[PDB]
Amino acid sequence: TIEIIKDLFEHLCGVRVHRTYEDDTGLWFDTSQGSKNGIMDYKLGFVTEVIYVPLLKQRTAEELQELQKKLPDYLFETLSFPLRSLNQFYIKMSKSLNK
Amino acid sequence: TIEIIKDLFEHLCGVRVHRTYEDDTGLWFDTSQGSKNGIMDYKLGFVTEVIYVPLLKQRTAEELQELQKKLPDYLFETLSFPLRSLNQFYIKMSKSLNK
Amino acid sequence: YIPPTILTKRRNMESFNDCK
Amino acid sequence: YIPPTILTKRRNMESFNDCK
Numbered sequence: 322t323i324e325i326i327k328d329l330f331e332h333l334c335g336v337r338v339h340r341t342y343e344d345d346t347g348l349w350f351d352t353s354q355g356s357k358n359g360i361m362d363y364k365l366g367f368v369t370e371v372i373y374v375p376l377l378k379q380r381t382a383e384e385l386q387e388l389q390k391k392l393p394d395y396l397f398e399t400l401s402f403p404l405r406s407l408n409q410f411y412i413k414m415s416k417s418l419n420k
Numbered sequence: 421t422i423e424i425i426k427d428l429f430e431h432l433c434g435v436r437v438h439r440t441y442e443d444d445t446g447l448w449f450d451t452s453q454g455s456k457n458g459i460m461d462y463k464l465g466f467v468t469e470v471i472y473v474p475l476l477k478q479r480t481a482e483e484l485q486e487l488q489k490k491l492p493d494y495l496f497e498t499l500s501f502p503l504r505s506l507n508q509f510y511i512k513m514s515k516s517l518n519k
Numbered sequence: 520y521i522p523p524t525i526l527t528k529r530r531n532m533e534s535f536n537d538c539k
Numbered sequence: 540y541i542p543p544t545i546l547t548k549r550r551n552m553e554s555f556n557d558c559k
Contacts, residue, residue, distance in 0.1 A: 408432060430527070475534035503542070
């Protein structure tokens with residue numbers, strides 16, 4: 322049941338949530354987003370305000386280069402933004418990777 | 421829990437999954453997608469053939485022409501399409517709602 | 520925690536009831 | 540049902556493991 326939700330949203334929006342976990346900082350999601358053109362691994366955390374942590378260490382240099390052409394400079398740094406703007410972020414992210 | 425996952429996609433993706441059920445025709449989701457500017461209720465089915473059922477019977481007359489101003493003819497008709505196309509369908513549905 | 524979205528209300532709406 | 544995608548494989552990746 323839980324998997325069908327994740328499976329639907331993988332194809333619908335190109336966002337797959339592998340895990341969710343809750344700690345002292347708040348509630349967290351492990352997310353990868355993209356298609357063939359570009360994939361982005363990040364953590365989504367809520368304290369409301371939302372925290373965006375990008376996982377670039379596993380990525381290769383060649384992988385980073387293609388992403389840097391398509392992605393703005395702010396997207397590679399950890400970002401804090403309010404919850405209302407959360408869809409705006411999804412827009413820019415999915416749109417930049419497809420570029 | 422999975423309620424948090426559903427809550428995440430409302431704000432991230434603009435799509436709310438009300439229900440998941442499986443009948444003899446296939447697997448279905450009661451889905452609503454949009455913002456204040458425009459809300460659309462439908463059924464997603466998976467047979468892999470994908471079946472989208474728009475729900476307009478209970479819709480208000482005042483609500484419909486605003487959708488008809490923002491959304492294309494095909495979006496008000498029941499459709500069938502393959503699985504690879506589902507993301508594009510989301511892009512059609514999302515973009516039309518933010519007009 | 521995530522506040523409820525506007526679309527949450529539509530879970531109880533009548534159009535969803537039919538499964539034919 | 541819904542077949543696997545490229546994003547599913549990334550669950551096992553090591554970058555997600557560290558949370559601090």
